[PDB]
């Protein structure tokens, strides 16, 4: 409506202080040329983001007007799990207050939505989400100060008379995606840059869609990961964004002209069924068709920043103390998900560690699907995936497993308390692939 590019409005601390409150209610809006009912935060979809920096007190109101209960996940934000309660139901009618202090040792993008075990993708895909970033010292040095900067929330939709789609039980299964491929709940963007450097904060807010990322004609600089900055960038060709993932990128204009940010063709493993004689099988349903997310536009003669040699030392993490493994494993007609076996219990502990010591998770995918692994609180470094050497060091804290493959995770223990891990397609979360980590 306004600037070419719409983005979220956002929320700053004031003297240290956010405290803001929200309601999650049925809210009618214009989304992509049309009027429907969507679940928003603060009357947005996405809903606003918030932006603080270390050591500020966030008190966030959470005011539920939802006809089912809900709950708020802090995701990637290493604070108590007594705030970031999983557990938590806040009832239809009722508030609740979350309050914390901003992590010193943190910098970057991470975002909020509902965590209520079971109820969580249908009211994910309804927009239920915003984000959270944590500004740092580091965006004063002059090559990330002078770059232009935008997020760009990744999530898709489907609409079904004026309201978000409802789930089928195929979507149970695979998690759902919607034909409406949104950016900041915009379709297709476009983005007339006006620096030849652009700082893009990416958020895949997706129920299960994943968004191979590919600017034409351009590489991209990955200088940000889920939960922290790289120690220098990483020129990369694409970038596969799993829903959950965060990362951020510098883009180097090199030319005026139009650019295509394209989310490529991608097969994730999900499933349909056939029926071809006798049959009723299930059958994969192949690569994503291609999609454009936005439209960038160089400015004229672009002459973009050198990138920055250094960002972020990343910490040398102590001797881990035990190794863990925990595998995954799918029964895909019975759309139910397991690890080590198990469905989760919110009675049963799985795991029990010591706070500040640091363990070795290795996180094997024996399904066929993608699955994106999730750990709350405790934010890890992928050592490596598929037994492939990860080629950075950054705090993350969502790791996409392709079928058969193994992240080896370090995981420094944090806050104590009981929080959980489990899969990011929340479709899959919701029918049980989640566990309790007890931490003392
Ligand atoms: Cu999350
Ligand atoms: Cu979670
Ligand atoms: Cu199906
Ligand atoms: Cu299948
Ligand atoms: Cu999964």
Known sequence: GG??????????????????????????????????????????????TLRVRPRDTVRLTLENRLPEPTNLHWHGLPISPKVDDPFLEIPPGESWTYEFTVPKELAGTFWYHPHLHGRVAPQLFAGLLGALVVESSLDAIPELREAEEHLLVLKDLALQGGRPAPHTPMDWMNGKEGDLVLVNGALRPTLVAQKATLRLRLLNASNARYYRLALQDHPLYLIAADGGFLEEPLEVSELLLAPGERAEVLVRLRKEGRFLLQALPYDRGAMGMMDMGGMAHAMPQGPSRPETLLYLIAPKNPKPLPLPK??????????????RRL????????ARFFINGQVFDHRRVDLKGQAQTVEVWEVENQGDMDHPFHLHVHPFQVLSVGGRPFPYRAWKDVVN??????????????????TVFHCHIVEHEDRGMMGVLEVG
Do not use: C, H, N
Request: a positive charge.
């Open 401 to 418: 497993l392709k079928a058969g493959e193994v992240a080896r995770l370090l995981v420094p223990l944090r806050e104590k308390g009981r």
């Open 310 to 323: 250094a960002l972020s030392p990343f910490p040398t993490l102590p001797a881990p103390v035990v190794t």
């Open 327 to 334: 595998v995954l494993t799918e029964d895909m007609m019975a």
């Open 3 to 48: 600037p070419s590019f719409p983005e979220p409005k956002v929320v700053r601390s004031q003297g240290g202080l956010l405290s803001l409150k929200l309601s999650a209610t049925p809210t009618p809006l214009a989304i992509a040329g049309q009027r429907a009912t969507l679940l928003t935060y603060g009357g947005s979809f996405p809903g606003p």
